[PDB]
Amino acid sequence: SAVPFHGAHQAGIATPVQDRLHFAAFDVTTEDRAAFVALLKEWTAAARRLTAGHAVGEGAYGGLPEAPPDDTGEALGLKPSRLTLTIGFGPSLFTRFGLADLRPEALADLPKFPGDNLDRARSGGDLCVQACADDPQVAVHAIRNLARIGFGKVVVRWSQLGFGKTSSTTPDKQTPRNLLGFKDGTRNIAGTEKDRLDRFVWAAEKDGTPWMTGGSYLVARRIRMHIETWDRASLQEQEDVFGRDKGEGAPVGKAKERDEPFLKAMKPDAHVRLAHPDSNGGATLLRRGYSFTDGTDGLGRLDAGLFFLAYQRDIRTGFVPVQRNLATDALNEYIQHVGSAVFAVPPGVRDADDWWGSTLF
Amino acid sequence: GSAVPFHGAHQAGIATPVQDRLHFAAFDVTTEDRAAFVALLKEWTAAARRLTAGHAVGEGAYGGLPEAPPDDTGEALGLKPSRLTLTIGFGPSLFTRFGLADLRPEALADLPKFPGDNLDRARSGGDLCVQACADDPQVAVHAIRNLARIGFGKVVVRWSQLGFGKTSSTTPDKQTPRNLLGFKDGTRNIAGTEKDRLDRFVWAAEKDGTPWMTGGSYLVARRIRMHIETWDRASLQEQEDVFGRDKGEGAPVGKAKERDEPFLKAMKPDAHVRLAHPDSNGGATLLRRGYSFTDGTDGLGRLDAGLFFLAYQRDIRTGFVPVQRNLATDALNEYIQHVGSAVFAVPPGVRDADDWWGSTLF
Numbered sequence: 267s268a269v270p271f272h273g274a275h276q277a278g279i280a281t282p283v284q285d286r287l288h289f290a291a292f293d294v295t296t297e298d299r300a301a302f303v304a305l306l307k308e309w310t311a312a313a314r315r316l317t318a319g320h321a322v323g324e325g326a327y328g329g330l331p332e333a334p335p336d337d338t339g340e341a342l343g344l345k346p347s348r349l350t351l352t353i354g355f356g357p358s359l360f361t362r363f364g365l366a367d368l369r370p371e372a373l374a375d376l377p378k379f380p381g382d383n384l385d386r387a388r389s390g391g392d393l394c395v396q397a398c399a400d401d402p403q404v405a406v407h408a409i410r411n412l413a414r415i416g417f418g419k420v421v422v423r424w425s426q427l428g429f430g431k432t433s434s435t436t437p438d439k440q441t442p443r444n445l446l447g448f449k450d451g452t453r454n455i456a457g458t459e460k461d462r463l464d465r466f467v468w469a470a471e472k473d474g475t476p477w478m479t480g481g482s483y484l485v486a487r488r489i490r491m492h493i494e495t496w497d498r499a500s501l502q503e504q505e506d507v508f509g510r511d512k513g514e515g516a517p518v519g520k521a522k523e524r525d526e527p528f529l530k531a532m533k534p535d536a537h538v539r540l541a542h543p544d545s546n547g548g549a550t551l552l553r554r555g556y557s558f559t560d561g562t563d564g565l566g567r568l569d570a571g572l573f574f575l576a577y578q579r580d581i582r583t584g585f586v587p588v589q590r591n592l593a594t595d596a597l598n599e600y601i602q603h604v605g606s607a608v609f610a611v612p613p614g615v616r617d618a619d620d621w622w623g624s625t626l627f
Numbered sequence: 628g629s630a631v632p633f634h635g636a637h638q639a640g641i642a643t644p645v646q647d648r649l650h651f652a653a654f655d656v657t658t659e660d661r662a663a664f665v666a667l668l669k670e671w672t673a674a675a676r677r678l679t680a681g682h683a684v685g686e687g688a689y690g691g692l693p694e695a696p697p698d699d700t701g702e703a704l705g706l707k708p709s710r711l712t713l714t715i716g717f718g719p720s721l722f723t724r725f726g727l728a729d730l731r732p733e734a735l736a737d738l739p740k741f742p743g744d745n746l747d748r749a750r751s752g753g754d755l756c757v758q759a760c761a762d763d764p765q766v767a768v769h770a771i772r773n774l775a776r777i778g779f780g781k782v783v784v785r786w787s788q789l790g791f792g793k794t795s796s797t798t799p800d801k802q803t804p805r806n807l808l809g810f811k812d813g814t815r816n817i818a819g820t821e822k823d824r825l826d827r828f829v830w831a832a833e834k835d836g837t838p839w840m841t842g843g844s845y846l847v848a849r850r851i852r853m854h855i856e857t858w859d860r861a862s863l864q865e866q867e868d869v870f871g872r873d874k875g876e877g878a879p880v881g882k883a884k885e886r887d888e889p890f891l892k893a894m895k896p897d898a899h900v901r902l903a904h905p906d907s908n909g910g911a912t913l914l915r916r917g918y919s920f921t922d923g924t925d926g927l928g929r930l931d932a933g934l935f936f937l938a939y940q941r942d943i944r945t946g947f948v949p950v951q952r953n954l955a956t957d958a959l960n961e962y963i964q965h966v967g968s969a970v971f972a973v974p975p976g977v978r979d980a981d982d983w984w985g986s987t988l989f
């Protein structure tokens with residue numbers, strides 16, 4: 267029903283993946299360090315209430331008639347819904363408050379990549395809040411109300427709703443399918459592998475930035491799918507793109523989805539073969555992305571795709587090498603990166619006295 | 628996760644209990660060949676039968692001819708029906724084609740201008756629509772996508788709307804949802820079991836004057852933006868005066884329970900419930916079935932939220948038109964703006980495995 271908010275790491279990275287996503291990036295409007303820290307403390311107090319399913323402050327109602335309610339109220343009567351709130355700090359934050367020398371070296375700016383068509387307005391951001399929950403209205407309410415508490419100190423830069431499986435009807439032991447119809451998530455880091463989390467995901471003290479110990483680095487890519495084109499490709503082109511069959515998700519030449527792949531039996535530019543850690547010196551990622559469908563553009567086409575999210579111990583040794591290796595991906599015919607951002611995700615809130623970003627400020 | 632039956636005297640997705648998710652699509656017809664269009668309708672009915680039962684369209688999502696693209700795009704494979712319903716409607720601009728002029732119902736009236744109307748002509752109108760409602764949004768998207776695929780060349784998508792969450796109720800025995808303004812929405816609606824209220828207020832009847840419409844309904848859709856910034860700085864008393872009900876329980880002003888009957892004269896003269904209530908509109912009654920939406924930011928540092936409002940009624944001229952006309956002085960107007968609009972005639976149900984969408988019209 268609820269995920270614990272306190273811990274060594276922030277929840278919502280290695281904790282079980284919830285049904286829905288509302289991702290928002292904020293820009294900071296204050297120059298005042300104190301004002302900003304005060305906001306971080308207020309945000310943490312509100313996150314505590316929200317993740318336990320209570321209203322922020324003095325509730326959505328029953329207060330002074332002459333005052334606006336503390337909480338906007340649209341979550342009353344709903345359950346915590348495994349809601350998690352994960353905050354991240356973007357590179358541009360460290361140009362404020364005199365933090366320029368505390369920017370972690372692992373929070374590297376992404377290269378320009380072949381094919382990039384990055385929409386400036388839907389990229390970047392001084393900080394982000396990732397709201398995950400099984401009920402989309404719980405997630406929205408959270409973002410809605412943090413934006414409200416921050417008004418005059420932050421604004422919403424861009425926002426993205428997303429969805430994965432629906433846990434009210436499908437088994438937790440069944441891989442969800444992306445909007446291209448293929449199983450997505452088969453060969454991923456799972457939250458149970460604390461050994462691979464420690465090696466590939468969490469910032470370690472001796473990494474170079476002590477305030478980030480227990481943190482992680484997040485890469486967000488908004489990836490449009492050319493759906494009508496994909497849907498016109500033969501079943502064989504589709505399976506050739508990935509190196510797995512569509513019905514079962516088995517690596518080509520194999521029988522069950524979870525059979526370990528034989529890379530030489532795949533086409534040289536098949537996605538799985540180019541993404542595999544064996545093709546990238548061991549580089550391994552934790553994918554935690556969500557599908558999106560926003561509507562339709564002015565040409566009739568479905569404005570849909572994958573809001574790709576990756577956690578990694580170092581952006582330099584995680585996302586950049588693998589993405590670089592996709593230069594020739596057969597899938598590139600069918601997708602387009604149109605938004606991008608990177609964030610440093612601080613360690614967890616240890617107890618009821620701690621706050622978001624305490625190690626940095 | 629059960630299925631909702633597709634056959635009936637009426638189309639599902641109207642009096643049916645309100646599912647969590649919506650994907651709504653308006654289509655324009657790009658063929659002039661009437662026989663082309665009827666075959667479309669027949670092929671779509673057959674896909675619909677599979678889709679509502681949790682089955683793949685045509686010959687399935689895989690295991691077909693390798694050189695050929697699959698019949699079903701496959702992103703619903705291994706998912707339950709999820710109470711998917713598919714409801715089709717014909718917009719007034721459709722009867723300009725195929726020699727249907729004299730068949731347009733009288734009850735499908737174009738809507739007049741309303742004060743404050745700021746209607747985007749792109750996200751308005753449509754030759755026909757499909758309302759897809761499901762508890763899983765992947766299921767709802769998959770249906771729309773596949774329907775539009777089957778219709779490549781005979782129809783294209785003029786505009787769509789996804790509702791991430793319901794703000795309506797047809798089952799008063801279950802909790803009333805809240806809209807993005809924080810109020811319960813749907814308390815005094817028409818319930819799917821109130822058959823006599825549905826017959827009186829929702830289903831078109833034979834003597835109404837358009838026979839092929841017997842058993843159908845008429846749909847009004849309004850895309851309504853909410854000025855949430857303005858709303859969120861209003862006092863709690865102001866928010867309660869706008870509606871006539873308190874925020875917490877959702878009870879009419881001065882009473883204690885959500886479902887106690889509102890006593891209209893204790894509400895402000897311009898309170899929403901006071902003005903929308905049937906007794907203020909000579910009995911006019913609507914079946915509300917709308918959904919919340921949010922379409923990113925506004926590029927001004929704020930979230931972009933609204934309500935995709937849908938009303939089914941027996942006659943547009945006696946349902947939505949008079950009630951919306953009485954809302955000219957509604958206190959709510961200060962916080963909302965109508966920015967999209969369309970009306971549709973929703974035909975009778977597909978009666979059996981041999982029938983098809985629109986058979987009574989064609």
Ligand code: HEM
Nearest residue numbers: 444448449450451452453489538541542543572588589601
């Ligand atoms: C629209 C965008 C994308 C789609 C539809 C897609 C799809 C898939 C599919 C179907 C699989 C096989 C099942 C699985 O293990 O998840 C896969 C695997 C994988 N993908 Fe992607 N992908 C996309 C973008 C990316 C990007 C941008 C990256 C990295 C920058 C990436 C990295 C990986 C990795 C590391 C694997 C696991 C490979 C293995 O170890 O077997 N993917 N992807």
Ligand code: HEM
Nearest residue numbers: 806810811812813814815851900903904905934950951963
């Ligand atoms: C953003 C726009 C709107 C919002 C937020 C909203 C909200 C509400 C709320 C909170 C109620 C009271 C609870 C209930 O009984 O359902 C209500 C009732 C009602 N509304 Fe609205 N509403 C909106 C637009 C409209 C429109 C456009 C119409 C008709 C054109 C309408 C017609 C009604 C009716 C008929 C009732 C039932 C009143 C009764 O008989 O007691 N509403 N609405």
